């Protein structure tokens, strides 16, 4: 019956919410990161260029995130890349894998119907706050 | 080498299974719970009134499943809206803030190609047993 | 601030990665394990016979990295059911209650718009390594 920590994170680093969310929860030590579309974080505009584009600026904005929480991307154990087009496959993976020099995350890659605002890509993460051990 | 607590989470103030999977699972202080549709508990219909009506009835299910874990919507960490279809963004996040007095979760939320039963919008969940600490 | 165990899960007995993602993750007591296919293990390709044997196969390799990681079908907490035909739901409901003797996990299900490969199937899951408790 301790009482865990649980700290909402929020960076200006990171577009704002565009409804009733929160960018990151930490509770404990997990960190469950919110869907970040291809968002510019002045804006809130979608970066033009399509999904290559929108995937960099995606994950640039999960970085904030987790540098907000003290975390890097070594500290991501799990992802989520929703595609609106599952051509794009190849594509962004070869964006996603510049993010990690380490071991990768476990993951989930697949296409939806529709993502907010038009987007072609969202990326979902869970990560847990270091120290984490090494093999 | 701890025995973490395990439990099942079960009430009939929430919809029956309609499949081989549990209302919700505590584990050690995290509590993941199956997605909601809006389903009358009574009965397991769809509530009738398109969307607007499902969020509601799919939010007082989880609700109730809170309830049962010793819960309340303030120990939600993570939500993941789906929806049927992406138009009803707007006015889902209207029913789904009336749920949250205080800080929002993390959430995810965008279109699906079909959830069952012709649901128009599911409301999945994870939240973390008390007490937690304030900011 | 103590160094909670990070592990990478692998194993020869479920399909090489395709892309930038471990198989599992162990963080703590918590495995998060990618979205499994029905890809037979050696070869990478789907199985043959549509959604019935997929998800079978996905369930087998799934089964392949618990067993890696120390754990069985036992050790799920939350499971997630994504199809490309929500048709399905009866057919794959039948194979995936087979591989749990004891109470379901948590559980989502849905139709998704495509997955990588054609696949008809694919099958998430989070499980806690044990001992966990008995009610």
């Known amino acids: 019956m301790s009482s865990l920590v649980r700290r909402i994170i929020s960076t200006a680093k990171a577009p704002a919410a565009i409804g009733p969310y929160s960018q990151a929860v930490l509770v404990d030590r997990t960190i469950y990161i919110s869907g970040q579309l291809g968002m510019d974080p002045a804006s809130g505009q979608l970066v033009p260029g399509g999904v290559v584009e929108e995937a960099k600026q995606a994950l640039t904005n999960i970085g904030e995130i987790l540098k907000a929480a003290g975390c890097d991307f070594t500290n991501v154990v799990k992802a989520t890349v929703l595609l609106a087009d599952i051509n794009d496959f190849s ?23 529709a993502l907010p605002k038009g987007g072609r890509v969202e990326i979902e993460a869970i990560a847990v706050q270091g120290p984490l051990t090494t093999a």
């Open 91 to 113: 594509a962004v993976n070869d964006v996603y894998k510049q993010y990690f020099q380490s071991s990768f995350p476990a993951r989930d890659a697949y296409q939806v119907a």
